[PDB]
Design a protein around this ligand. Structure first.
Ligand SMILES: [Ca+2]
Ligand SMILES: [Cl-]
Lengths: 462, 107
């Protein structure tokens, strides 16, 4: 393509925003300044992301382009790319491209980034066999047969599409990093062929059988979060794993993890785990997620001295004291458990986020010296006191203590009872099996602020 | 202002290799728990310039980075997460989120 003679920049690039950008690239003072083909023929790269471009009309005269960035714009038609056969790399994520037919003869492409578009038919990719990087997430792709001849691919991402059939991946044995998350995949048997895989991300699919992973011994990163896993026996073979995400599945038996001592991050939340003994040797762990299981005994955590992040919320834990040795902890979440004694938490001097609501905590004094705290959760405690004798008039000590050691006055007291520090008193005409009170006290520890609140049940025995 | 947010610290090495977008961390509200929860983010690098460096998967809360970073250009981003139920109700207040750009490694 050539402009016959010199033309105003704003006549070649009809897009207002692209005309401005090209005025700067082409060293001119305004958009109506004329330019020659020889000026145009100098442009070899173009960074034009984030400029509100709607049309790339004019780009066809930039004959020597090898790399372009038009990401984060409002492109629909990419026809002007069709003849730009010196293009090696294209960044075009976050546009409204529906038709990629203009890419079909760009056979020198080694990188093509097209995520976040309106792409369905990828047949125009089929002859782009020099590609080593290809990013197609967040489109409406259901057929990846066009990928089958892309035998130099090292990195491939098509997460957030509607793919069921992975068979076209079979011959892509140079793949090292693959992401197929948020598709409609159940059968990952073709993945057994991809023995060079180092990273496999496959969250939010319908995978129950992971036997095909058994020979993928080069895997260092694996994510199967949001699947239907139960038997993870195959993972024992994956001795190079350092980062493993298995959250939101149906796993109970963790024995296959026990030899995976390279692990530094391990997500196991939302499963069926009641025994974490097999985790005890994973001493390189800095992050461990165990929320939403059926844990009571967490004693096997005590040796994991490198943990800086730990989740335990939604379990059946009464004894939190195994965390006392995890002196590097910076964030600890254990909301919805049955913990009453937080004396052990005085040890976690570097703690910054402490999330402890919906437990049985009555006394904040062991937390008083934790001044690196910036986020704090103490709402909605509840516990039941040891019973006391039912009588016509019943008096109990209030036992809710603030961080200062001062008793916190009840907010409400059942059965018309009253408070005179330190005693809560009820006049009880007829026998009742229990009485109760609530408390609600804003509090700050360091720079972390919450409402320390709860409901206290007092059984009365006759 | 912690509410029911559960968020790991977030760092991203500069000069990362693809494929993009790449998972950083999975953000969670435990009202999820008692419903499906739907996530969004705001801040410089999300909805204000530079726009779209970070995005979040609405249904899963996966926070992702969309291109290579440069510590000499931006070293930290401050973002804010938001959570709502299927009925549209807000199930959390916004949470300020730091993202630290760190040494490169070939991940
Ligand atoms: Ca969660
Ligand atoms: Cl909490």
């Amino acid at each position: 393509a050539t402009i016959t003679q010199d033309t105003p920049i704003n006549q070649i690039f009809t897009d207002t925003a692209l005309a401005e950008k090209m005025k700067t690239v082409l060293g001119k003072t305004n958009v109506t300044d004329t330019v020659s083909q020889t000026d145009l023929d100098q442009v070899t790269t173009l960074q034009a992301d984030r400029l509100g471009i709607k049309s790339i009309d004019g780009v066809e005269y930039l004959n020597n382009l090898t790399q372009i960035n038009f990401s984060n714009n409002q492109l629909t038609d990419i026809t002007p790319l069709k003849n730009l056969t010196k293009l090696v790399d294209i960044l075009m994520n976050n546009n409204q491209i529906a038709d990629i037919t203009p890419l079909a003869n760009l056979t020198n492409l080694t990188g093509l980034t097209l995520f976040n578009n309106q792409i369905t038919d990828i047949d125009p990719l089929k002859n782009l066999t020099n590609l080593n990087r290809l990013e197609l997430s967040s489109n409406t792709i259901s057929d990846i047969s066009a990928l089958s001849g892309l035998t130099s691919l090292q990195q491939l991402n098509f997460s957030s599409n509607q793919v069921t059939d992975l068979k076209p991946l079979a011959n892509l044995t140079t793949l090292e990093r693959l992401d197929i998350s948020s598709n409609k995949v159940s059968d990952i048997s073709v993945l057994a062929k991809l023995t060079n895989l180092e990273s496999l991300i496959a969250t939010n699919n319908q995978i129950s059988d992971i036997t095909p992973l058994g020979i993928l011994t080069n895997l260092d990163e694996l994510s199967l979060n949001g699947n239907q896993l139960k038997d993870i026996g195959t993972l024992a073979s994956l001795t190079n794993l350092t980062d493993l995400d298995l959250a939101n599945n149906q796993i109970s038996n963790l024995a296959p993890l026990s030899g995976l001592t390279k692990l530094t991050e391990l997500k196991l939340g939302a499963n069926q785990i009641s025994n974490i003994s097999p985790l005890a040797g994973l001493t390189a762990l800095t992050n461990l997620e165990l929320n939403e299981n059926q844990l009571e005994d967490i004693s096997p955590i005590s040796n994991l001295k490198n943990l800086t992040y730990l989740t335990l919320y939604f379990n059946n834990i009464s004894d939190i004291s195994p965390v006392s040795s995890l002196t590097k902890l910076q964030r600890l979440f254990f909301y919805n458990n049955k913990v009453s004694d937080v004396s052990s938490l005085a040890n976690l001097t570097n703690i910054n986020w402490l999330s402890a609501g919906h437990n049985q905590i009555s006394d904040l004094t062991p937390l008083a010296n934790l001044t690196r705290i910036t986020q704090l959760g103490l709402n909605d405690q509840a516990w039941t006191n040891a019973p006391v004798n039912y009588k016509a008039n019943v008096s109990i000590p209030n036992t809710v203590k603030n961080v200062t050691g001062a008793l916190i006055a009840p907010a409400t007291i059942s059965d018309g009872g009253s408070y005179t520090e330190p005693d809560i008193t009820w006049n009880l005409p007829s026998y009742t099996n229990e009485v109760s009170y609530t408390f609600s006290q804003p509090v700050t520890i360091g720079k972390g602020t919450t409402t320390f609140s709860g409901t206290v049940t007092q059984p009365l025995k006759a | 202002p912690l509410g029911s947010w559960v968020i790991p610290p977030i760092s991203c090495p500069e000069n990362e290799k693809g494929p993009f977008p790449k998972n950083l961390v999975q953000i969670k509200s435990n009202k999820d728990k008692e419903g499906k929860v739907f996530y969004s983010i705001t801040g410089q690098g999300a909805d204000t310039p530079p726009v779209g460096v970070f995005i979040i998967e609405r249904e899963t809360g996966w926070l992702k980075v969309t291109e290579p970073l440069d510590r000499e250009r931006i070293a930290t981003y401050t973002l804010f997460s938001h959570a709502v139920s299927s009925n549209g109700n807000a199930v959390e207040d916004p949470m300020e989120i730091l993202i630290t750009v760190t040494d490169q490694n070939d991940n």
